[PDB]
Amino acid sequence: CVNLTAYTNSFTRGVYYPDKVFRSSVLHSTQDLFLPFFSNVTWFHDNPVLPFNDGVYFASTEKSNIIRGWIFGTTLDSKTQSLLIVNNATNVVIKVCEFQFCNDPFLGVYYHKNNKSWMESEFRVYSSANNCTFEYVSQPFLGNFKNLREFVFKNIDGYFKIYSKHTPINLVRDLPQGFSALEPLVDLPIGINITRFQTLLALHRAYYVGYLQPRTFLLKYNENGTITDAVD
Amino acid sequence: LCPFGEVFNATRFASVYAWNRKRISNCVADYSVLYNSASFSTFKCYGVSPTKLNDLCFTNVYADSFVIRGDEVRQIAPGQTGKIADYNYKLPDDFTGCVIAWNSNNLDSKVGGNYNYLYRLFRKSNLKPFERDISTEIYQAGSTPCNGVEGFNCYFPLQSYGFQPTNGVGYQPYRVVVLSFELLHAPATVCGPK
Amino acid sequence: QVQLVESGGGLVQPGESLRLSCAASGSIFGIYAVHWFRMAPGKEREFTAGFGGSTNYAASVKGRFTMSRDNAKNTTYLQMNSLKPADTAVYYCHALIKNELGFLDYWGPGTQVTVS
Ligand SMILES: *[C@@H]1O[C@H](CO)[C@@H](O[C@@H]2O[C@H](CO)[C@@H](O[C@@H]3O[C@H](CO)[C@@H](O)[C@H](O)[C@@H]3O)[C@H](O)[C@H]2NC(C)=O)[C@H](O)[C@H]1NC(C)=O
Ligand SMILES: *[C@@H]1O[C@H](CO)[C@@H](O[C@@H]2O[C@H](CO)[C@@H](O[C@@H]3O[C@H](CO)[C@@H](O)[C@H](O)[C@@H]3O)[C@H](O)[C@H]2NC(C)=O)[C@H](O)[C@H]1NC(C)=O
Ligand SMILES: *[C@@H]1O[C@H](CO)[C@@H](O[C@@H]2O[C@H](CO)[C@@H](O[C@@H]3O[C@H](CO)[C@@H](O)[C@H](O)[C@@H]3O)[C@H](O)[C@H]2NC(C)=O)[C@H](O)[C@H]1NC(C)=O
Ligand SMILES: *[C@@H]1O[C@H](CO)[C@@H](O[C@@H]2O[C@H](CO)[C@@H](O)[C@H](O)[C@H]2NC(C)=O)[C@H](O)[C@H]1NC(C)=O
Ligand SMILES: *[C@@H]1O[C@H](CO)[C@@H](O)[C@H](O)[C@H]1NC(C)=O
């Protein structure tokens, strides 16, 4: 590892779908860890480890792709099991291992000697891998910055839940007025004790942050099933 | 469907003294193969009933593969003071793991003799449950230690299996895989086929 | 699939110095221990040289024996000096290595050296 030498009025963002079974045209209330309306949560873009307090909301407004994944571990020390999420355009892999991470988190990218083929294989995230308990190969998922990638992570009851959605809006304005209905992507049964979280990016060698809060919210379902309106 | 069959179909198994451990998770486990007998010898499967295994759910399963003479197959059991337990491979006192043994004398044995495998029979202390011991340090059956593993004073702990084809069932080598099962607060990876 | 190739074994006079190189052809994750064993006339399965952690050799030949463990070139070297007719033996390789296919122990075909 080669070591190298903001909040907006937050209303109607990332309410995830609580249940997968189909429902239609009804006003339902559920009390669960949710992001409050007008919560004024923070926005990121220069990346410190952020403590995982509750479930976490996250957003990506930029059109181009630079996000290479995230880092999930209680401490930099190896002893604590670590969830290395891997978001590489070639491969997206959930790897859970007893990781001793390097001082600087960024991974490394370079082109080939004679082919000049830009290889992102080299990693500079963890110094060592002590005990690697888990491996999963998931589906590799991806000027006005139209697209919006919105995510929620929820780690309770030995279950780690990934709530994911994406929608483009040509508006460059940072936070759209319109409602955000969010679908669960993956579930992990690892249940590793996670007290802190960091992003992960690559290096040549725009990031809403909110915490779920316990409160009951009312949802009106569409005939199709979408969350047309969400209220306090 | 994680490859529970590949250990049954592995080319060659590990030695007695050094046992390879494979852990299977994030997969559905099938006990249908274990419903069929491994060989003419019926496997001894401790803990839960073999007929009930499909209903079981284990947080993690640990598989160990090794070849042992037919005489000592009865020796392996939860927590008994034995040569394999004390020096080769120790199993906790009360364990629910499942042992699968199938005769391999035909494939394994060589007329010239295959010494690919050794056992430890010598140690000053006791073996904890589930710690592979690869130590080759000098052993002293006599009280006085020696340097340079002198024969009459110091006797080497490891001795090989000849595996000459022998009619005696005790000498006949069986391939044995043990399945350690453990449960904790984490959800169980094992799932039933139906 | 680690393959052990023995080199340097030849018939020599007593008192000579010889080296056996046991090159590991197959790829490896990491090596735990590699142990030399002797087939000598009038001698059974016995421990030539290896470890025990710290390097260990046999009786009456511990000084003669020399172990060169090389983790970069993946070839171990055994040097035996001041040879005697009793050292006429097939020196069987035995490498305990965990590799891509898995943890395993592999036995080298061995080379016979005749001393008289
Ligand atoms: C970004 O860099 C490279 C880009 O290809 C990725 O390397 C891939 O990493 C995966 C997971 O570590 C590996 O694939 C695995 O291959 C084994 C056989 O060796 C097989 O069981 C599976 O097919 C499994 O996916 C492999 O190292 C490599 N795969 C390929 C196709 O290149 C890398 O993981 C990406 N991410 C990071 C953080 O570097
Ligand atoms: C996570 O990895 C660590 C790596 O240090 C494991 O700790 C030790 O790992 C070594 C691996 O060789 C083992 O110790 C070995 O066997 C005995 C144990 O008393 C002893 O002669 C030496 O310590 C020898 O190195 C053993 O697995 C473990 N030992 C202890 C005392 O913890 C740790 O177990 C791993 N955690 C897991 C797999 O959950
Ligand atoms: C709830 O949503 C589902 C989504 O599948 C509705 O089913 C039908 O979905 C297709 C696929 O887009 C619609 O085709 C499109 O219709 C629009 C409007 O006419 C047209 O402009 C497009 O070119 C395309 O043909 C289809 O219209 C839609 N069904 C109907 C009756 O509109 C499902 O019907 C929805 N249920 C309700 C009524 O809430
Ligand atoms: C793997 O080895 C077994 C050893 O006999 C082969 O036969 C299987 O044996 C188990 C014993 O419990 C039975 O449950 C299976 O039904 C047997 N399989 C058959 C008869 O096809 C097995 O065929 C080998 N598998 C492979 C892929 O070579
Ligand atoms: C998780 O780690 C924190 C930090 O040490 C600790 O306070 C907490 O008790 C741990 N919880 C579990 C379930 O391990």
Please state whether beta strands B173-182 and B98-103 pair in parallel, antiparallel, or not at all (unpaired).
antiparallel
Q: How many residues does chain A have?
A: 232
Residue keyed to tokens 């401790």: B46
Interface mutation target, options C45, C55, C61, C107, chain B, most CBs of B under 10 Å: C45
Q: Residue A25: helix, strand or coil by DSSP?
A: coil
Phi-psi region of B38 (alpha: psi -120 to 50; beta: other; left: phi over 0): alpha
CA distance readout (Å), B6 to A135, A203, A227, B3, B11: 19, 41, 47, 5, 9
Amino acid at C64: R
Tell me the two tokens of residue C116.
């008289």
Give the separation between CA B86 and CA B105, rounded to whole angstroms. Answer: 25
Tell me the two tokens of residue A105.
């988190």
Q: With DSSP H G I counted as helix, E B as strand and the rest as coil, what are the percentages for chain B, rounded to 5?
A: 15, 20, 65
Structural domain contains residue B57: yes
| Header resolution in angstroms | 5.9
Give the separation between CA B19 and CA A209, rounded to whole angstroms. Answer: 48
Q: What angle do CA C39, C45, C51 make, to 5 degrees?
A: 100
Amino acid at B140: Q
CATH of the domain at B60: 3.30.70.1840
Give the separation between CA A98 and CA B26, rounded to whole angstroms. Answer: 17
Domains identified in chain B, total number: 1
The residue among A210, A196, A207, A204 whose CA lies nearest residue A46 is: A207
Nearest CA in chain B to C104: B14
Sign of torsion over alpha carbons B145, B150, B152, B156? positive
Residue nearest to atom 2 of ligand 5 (CA): A193
Residues with Cβ within 8 Å of B134's Cβ and at least 6 positions away in sequence, in order, are B17, B18, C32, C33, C96
Structural domain contains residue B52: yes
Residue nearest to atom 20 of ligand 2 (CA): B131
Contact in structure between B122 and B51 (CB atoms under 8 Å): no
CA distance C111 to chain B (A): 16
Is CATH 3.40.50.150 what the domain over C4-113 is classified as, yes or no?
Answer: no
For residue C57, report the phi and psi dihedrals to the nearest 5 degrees. Answer: -130, 175
Structural domain contains residue B191: no
Residue nearest to atom 2 of ligand 1 (CA): A121
- Whether C52 contacts chain B with CB within 8 A: yes
What is the number of CB-based contacts under 8 A between chain A and chain B? 17
CATH of the domain at A169: 2.60.120.960
The residue among C35, C37, C26, C32 whose CA lies nearest residue C2 is: C26
How was this structure determined? It was done by: cryo-EM
Give the count of alpha carbons within 13 A of A176, CB side only: 21
Pocket test for ligand 4, best of B1, B8, B11, B174 (most atoms within 8 A of CB): B8
Eight-class DSSP state of B50:
G
Residues with Cβ within 8 Å of B168's Cβ and at least 6 positions away in sequence, in order, are none
Contact in structure between B86 and B123 (CB atoms under 8 Å): yes
Structural domain contains residue A2: no
CA distance readout (Å), B33 to A12, A49, B14, B29, B87: 53, 48, 21, 10, 31
Which residues of chain C neighbour B149 with C-beta distances below 8 Å? 47, 56, 58-59
Nearest CA in chain A to B184: A158
Question: DSSP for A116-131?
Answer: ---B-----SEEEE--
The residue among A54, A58, A53 whose CA lies nearest residue A14 is: A58
CA distance readout (Å), A140 to A38, A70, A77, A90, B186: 33, 15, 29, 8, 27
Beta pairing partners, B115: none
The domain in which residue A115 lies consists of 25-142+144-231
Structural domain contains residue A81: yes
The residue among A210, A156, A152 whose CA lies nearest residue A188 is: A156
Give the separation between CA C84 and CA A144, rounded to whole angstroms. Answer: 85
Q: Which of A134, A136, A189 sits opposite B187 (nearest CB)?
A: A189
Buried b / exposed e over A29-64, threshold 16 CB at 10 Å, is: eeeeebbbbebebebeeeeeeeebebbbbbbbbeee
